[PDB]
Design a protein around this ligand. Structure first.
Ligand SMILES: [Ca+2]
Ligand SMILES: [Ca+2]
Ligand SMILES: [Ca+2]
Ligand SMILES: [Ca+2]
Ligand SMILES: [Ca+2]
Ligand SMILES: [Ca+2]
Ligand SMILES: [Ca+2]
Ligand SMILES: [Ca+2]
Ligand SMILES: [Ca+2]
Ligand SMILES: [Ca+2]
Ligand SMILES: [Ca+2]
Ligand SMILES: [Ca+2]
Ligand SMILES: [Cl-]
Ligand SMILES: [Cl-]
Ligand SMILES: [Cl-]
Ligand SMILES: [Cl-]
Ligand SMILES: [Cl-]
Ligand SMILES: [Cl-]
Ligand SMILES: [Cl-]
Ligand SMILES: [Cl-]
Ligand SMILES: [Cl-]
Ligand SMILES: [Cl-]
Ligand SMILES: [Cl-]
Ligand SMILES: [Cl-]
Ligand SMILES: [Cl-]
Ligand SMILES: [Cl-]
Ligand SMILES: [Cl-]
Ligand SMILES: [Cl-]
Ligand SMILES: [Cl-]
Ligand SMILES: [Cl-]
Ligand SMILES: [Cl-]
Ligand SMILES: [Cl-]
Ligand SMILES: [Cl-]
Ligand SMILES: [Cl-]
Ligand SMILES: [Cl-]
Ligand SMILES: [Cl-]
Ligand SMILES: [Cl-]
Ligand SMILES: [Cl-]
Ligand SMILES: [Cl-]
Ligand SMILES: [Cl-]
Ligand SMILES: [Cl-]
Ligand SMILES: [Cl-]
Ligand SMILES: [Cl-]
Ligand SMILES: [Cl-]
Ligand SMILES: [Cl-]
Ligand SMILES: [Cl-]
Ligand SMILES: [Cl-]
Ligand SMILES: [Cl-]
Ligand SMILES: [Cl-]
Ligand SMILES: [Cl-]
Ligand SMILES: [Cl-]
Ligand SMILES: [Cl-]
Ligand SMILES: [Cl-]
Ligand SMILES: [Cl-]
Ligand SMILES: [Cl-]
Ligand SMILES: [Cl-]
Ligand SMILES: [Cl-]
Ligand SMILES: [Cl-]
Ligand SMILES: [Cl-]
Ligand SMILES: [Cl-]
Ligand SMILES: [Mn+2]
Ligand SMILES: [Mn+2]
Ligand SMILES: [Mn+2]
Ligand SMILES: [Mn+2]
Ligand SMILES: [Mn+2]
Ligand SMILES: [Mn+2]
Ligand SMILES: [Mn+2]
Ligand SMILES: [Mn+2]
Lengths: 387, 387, 387, 387
């Protein structure tokens, strides 16, 4: 009955189930949650662990004594439940000081503060056992063209990530970074707007091996992109260090629906890919229970995230294992796609008259791809309609 | 009066002014143009040169004798006019054989044919003096999830680009490649959908120095992305080898409006950036005179491409040179954005109490960015409304 | 096994399965189909009937003798198979004469021709038994602001529809009109871009009772709108005279995927609504088998349209019939939504202190809507995962 | 120098310049403004007046004594400055009680409360001299399909608007209603998502003459629609009772940029249309000074709204008055578009062989529309580049 257990590696941000329901036009609809209660309730639902922004776990401006008490209580809840903390991150977007960015703020003093705030929380993340440190630069960008010279901003962004890499290397930490793209919101345009832009940026860092991406379903979908395709490119690059799962209904404000909502067929193809590729990282949900809901609805929404993942996992596995689907994949030449174009080499290709001079383009053109039959087998599997 | 001359490096594809006006629901509205007439008419408008797909210049399936005559006539028109050919490309999308791709077709024989067709035209491009060879893989992608394993497809795409790099190196050619992203159309989703994805992909090629991007205004805008931002990242990476200029009104079918149409403020910020950065490549238009137009409207539309570039160049230069704008840029701390965050180094940053322990976050937060005043100065400059 | 029969009222345009695969960048991939063969093959798949544009059935420019032979052969195929023709329409978009519109062309002579062409085909539609006459004004609109005064264009559009209403009334025909909205493509913006705009326009016609809408799934989705919501408003207005079913993956070019592809949850909620409302019209597919496919894939794609409708019908019916869902609907106050706000009347409402002075807004605010539990029951039903 | 005066009828919501800068991921960046200070500062900039939600002027939950003092101070500021209040509206979206809607909340008691809250503020609006009462039902809609039966919701929405019409008629008030569409945000989909849907809905109300639309630039643009086209349809229907002016960069979250920002050419064509049509209502700005700004930037942003309107007004007037543009409009047959298609009547059209039998479709098709020359004249006028 699609019941999650910790072995499924499902994780949730404190800020997800703890979202009080403030949106772009309305006040909170739910009380704040104590992180300890979220840990306990998520454990009861079969979660593996939780994640946090610094400021979710320790109220901004806490004294050292307050900070230690907040961490102590949280660690007791983790120990009580067996929950893990595989990932943490920094809040460089809520406080008004970050209104023009953290690492790419025009104000140099703000950039320095952003780095210090991040470094403090990296230490805590390591203490709590996190393997991955996410950076979502939600305030990095602009509403107008003159406000942000993007080459200068990318110089500053590279400088910041390089310094963080220097820091973790200097401390002997094993933690790695995962940069999270988003195309817009809260800035009119955000820097590193997609998986591609973040992958490209990482290749200019001094120690690129320390950085990957943390793609979020809804974020790539806010640019109308195909999330499974972007995940495939991240996997191809060896850079899928973490992932955020949720739902999004098209190009509009960031909805953060529970996973499986939004584009359900995209959710199916995503799970198919993660499972086929043997992705071994957390299945992390960055979602918002809608502000229509009370706390019972919060936990229902969270449970539904995990349930939908497990249903889609079953259906994708059944699809790939079905001999009729395997025959259809051959009919559509997916096997040929996985074979080298010219393992014979360039000169052999140039000398091969079957590749040009004597290639029957019309016969090749006439061969149907049989993709519709393949896709209706996929639909039948997804819907449990084989027959 | 914003009159273009060849020194402005404006170029046009044969397929642009030669577009007969077939769209997704209608037949041609204009006769085919002889490339020779397009060269002559573009030269008369002040163009610098022209570009071509193989199949624009030599009808598909031409005999060797026909091919030589087509090239001979074209070269006579170039010589007659002083027009150059700075870029050429391959048509790997029109012929039905490419219905599932060229370099990433599931059928291996089609992939081999795509490479042979490309190599043949690289030789011709070099003969005609082209410095850049564009590849727009418009058929690389999918309408459905099972049809295309994207990791396998990227393996094939890398194999193809690596072989082309091997080929140009083997012939001692100086030509470089420019990969053109597009998010969708004609495929439901296209591989390397944005500037970021193409930049990232290039970093996995064997000889990455031989490849850059050929971004198109409308294509990034079809993903709702900020084209000037993407161009800034391409410049930051040193990969803006070529550019396609046109207009697009938002997220919808690829309109290919004349440059300046569509998002006019984005056109202003693009020209500002290209000129500020000293981009030295062709200002190439990949546009379609709308099918409402007759041939007089074709040449009016082409002229308007160049006129709009020159108006925006004047206004951007005036903006940047205006002492009041320079003061506003300082007021908004664009100067600070261009200064290193921590040239003092990591340890100095960690030891700097002004960066954290004694940082007055509220005072920093209270400092307005003054971006609206800056942007209204930009608006006033664009519209010729200073005062 | 979700097998369609004619009693299901599934219909297809000749132009759908007959699409030769010309798209915005490529040549045909399939031969033209004889309408007679399409009728026979669709009947074999369990279709109820077919629809046509004038020019699909009778080649443009046919002599009277040719026209009679084309119609005679078609009527023999209908008689041979038991297929019906519930709807027909006019092609006012392919021929270059319609490059600026039919009914709202700037050229008056073109507007008059568009009306004559339409009237000729209304007569034929009636002859063949059609109850509904669709008008999709794909060329009505503009790429630029000065080209089309939209108030004048709406005057001309109203004049045209009024004349068609006068014509059918004058002939005693029972046929009604269904106006099909689309937001863009092939024009940069199309007039009457959504279901709302078409409904509003109908209310200004002289005989509004003769006109409804023909909404298409993909078209409303090209504006990022919720298709089930638009269908509900059309039903609410009593104007759902016909519908086009297909799939669309977001805001981009008009894909015309087979029904069930694209937004699958939107397809589920659409079928739920059509069945709940007792929509009695044709379940018509306006789709394109992708140009990757050969003719076997054409018929597979067509079959899949009908199969997906029948699967979703089963799952929606199961959802609505499930006592646990009925309890959840009460928990979410869907029953209360269907009860009048103030059947007691305005004065009673003003005098009701429980509605304001003594309304406990905080207690009301605290009541969760329980929408996530309801939606996960819907997801479970769709996926066949109850348990 | 494009200086606004009250005669220009520029108005601003209290909530616009008073926006404290809370967005979907961040805390306030500016202190709350006293409405009295906003009235004074807007008057100094040349504004004509201000608008308000009930809860902007009187803090939610105010005692009668507090309410009277808030109104008294506001009326003194209006009297001190000569500012008017042409429009008011209700906040049916901020308070958590409205989390599932006001007029279409599933909870009947909430619907009744929404009406009482609205009626109370209609009385105040009339007291303060407002001619128009706006309703933006930002919470009316859904995130999931089962949560909202849209036919039932439209029944409730009609009931609510009918009761408000009954109320204003019963009091002898001259005020009229303006319904504001928005496609999404804060709900996943909002009911009456576009100008078309709102126009259509109004035609089912008991007293349709009392209701028009209040279209907002950014809202129609969030559906990728052409705002000038939608305004033309509203004008055509005689329903443009009020308008909200601002900017939006494409399909994404509601940006509420200052007017002129976003789609600048759409702003030009909008002003051209409002001025050509003789729209006589307020030029109201519903905008947000970006949260990057301090209060000096708030007033700069507000000033820029009015400045951009006045620049575009000048350029549109110059365009329409230019004899070369008038010649181009004739060349493009805009004059013919404004002439009846068939004032001769249906029978004359049927009998006119020049309309069909003897219509030279090829000669008509060959006639270019000359739209590109016309549009480049428009561009030249907008940019002050004639020559
Ligand atoms: Ca409860
Ligand atoms: Ca292999
Ligand atoms: Ca072979
Ligand atoms: Ca002409
Ligand atoms: Ca510097
Ligand atoms: Ca210092
Ligand atoms: Ca076959
Ligand atoms: Ca009832
Ligand atoms: Ca009661
Ligand atoms: Ca200041
Ligand atoms: Ca007239
Ligand atoms: Ca005449
Ligand atoms: Cl898992
Ligand atoms: Cl709050
Ligand atoms: Cl609360
Ligand atoms: Cl509580
Ligand atoms: Cl310093
Ligand atoms: Cl980069
Ligand atoms: Cl790396
Ligand atoms: Cl990986
Ligand atoms: Cl959903
Ligand atoms: Cl999909
Ligand atoms: Cl709830
Ligand atoms: Cl709640
Ligand atoms: Cl130039
Ligand atoms: Cl053609
Ligand atoms: Cl022709
Ligand atoms: Cl001709
Ligand atoms: Cl072989
Ligand atoms: Cl990559
Ligand atoms: Cl490189
Ligand atoms: Cl470069
Ligand atoms: Cl434009
Ligand atoms: Cl811009
Ligand atoms: Cl023309
Ligand atoms: Cl033409
Ligand atoms: Cl049915
Ligand atoms: Cl063809
Ligand atoms: Cl063929
Ligand atoms: Cl064949
Ligand atoms: Cl006449
Ligand atoms: Cl209307
Ligand atoms: Cl009616
Ligand atoms: Cl109906
Ligand atoms: Cl799909
Ligand atoms: Cl849905
Ligand atoms: Cl096939
Ligand atoms: Cl084929
Ligand atoms: Cl005005
Ligand atoms: Cl706040
Ligand atoms: Cl503050
Ligand atoms: Cl202050
Ligand atoms: Cl009651
Ligand atoms: Cl309606
Ligand atoms: Cl009315
Ligand atoms: Cl009006
Ligand atoms: Cl802007
Ligand atoms: Cl425009
Ligand atoms: Cl400021
Ligand atoms: Cl501020
Ligand atoms: Mn998100
Ligand atoms: Mn995230
Ligand atoms: Mn293009
Ligand atoms: Mn291009
Ligand atoms: Mn369509
Ligand atoms: Mn259709
Ligand atoms: Mn807005
Ligand atoms: Mn508004």
């Amino acid at each position: 009955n699609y019941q999650p257990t910790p072995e499924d590696r499902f994780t949730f941000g404190l800020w997800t189930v703890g979202w009080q329901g403030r949106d772009p036009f309305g006040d909170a609809t739910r009380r704040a949650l104590d992180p300890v209660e979220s840990v306990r309730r998520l454990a009861e639902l079969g979660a593996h662990g939780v994640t946090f922004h610094d400021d979710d776990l320790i109220p901004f401006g806490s004294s050292d004594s307050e900070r230690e008490e907040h961490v102590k209580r949280f660690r007791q809840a983790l120990d009580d439940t067996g929950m893990k903390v595989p990932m943490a991150t920094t809040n460089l977007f809520t406080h008004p000081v970050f209104k023009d960015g953290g690492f790419t703020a025009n104000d140099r003093d703000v950039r320095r503060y952003a780095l210090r705030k991040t470094i403090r929380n990296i230490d805590l993340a390591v203490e709590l056992g996190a393997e991955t440190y996410v950076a979502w630069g939600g305030r990095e960008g602009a509403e107008s063209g003159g406000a942000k010279d993007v080459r200068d901003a990318l110089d500053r962004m590279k400088e910041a990530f390089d310094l963080l890499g220097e820091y973790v290397t200097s401390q002997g930490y094993d933690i790695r970074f995962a940069i999270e793209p988003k195309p817009n919101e809260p800035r009119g345009d955000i820097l590193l707007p997609t998986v591609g832009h973040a992958l490209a940026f990482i290749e200019r860092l001094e120690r690129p091996e320390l950085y990957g991406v943390n793609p979020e379903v809804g974020h790539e979908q806010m640019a109308g992109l195909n999330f499974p395709h972007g995940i495939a490119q991240a996997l191809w690059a060896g850079k899928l260090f973490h992932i955020d799962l949720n739902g999004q209904n098209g190009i509009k404000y960031d909805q953060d629906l529970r996973f499986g909502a939004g584009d359900l067929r995209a959710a199916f193809w995503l799970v198919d890919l993660l499972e086929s590729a043997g992705y071994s990282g957390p299945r992390h949900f960055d979602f918002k229970p809608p502000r229509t809901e009370d706390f019972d609805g919060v936990w229902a929404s969270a449970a539904g995230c995990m349930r939908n993942y497990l249903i889609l996992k079953e259906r994708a596995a059944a699809f790939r294992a079905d001999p009729e689907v395997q025959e259809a994949l051959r009919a559509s030449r997916l096997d040929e796609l996985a074979r080298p174009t010219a393992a014979d080499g360039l000169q052999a290709l140039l000398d091969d008259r079957s590749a040009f001079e004597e290639f029957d383009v019309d016969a090749a053109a006439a061969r149907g791809m049989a993709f519709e039959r393949l896709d209706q087998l996929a639909m039948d599997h997804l819907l449990g309609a084989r027959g």
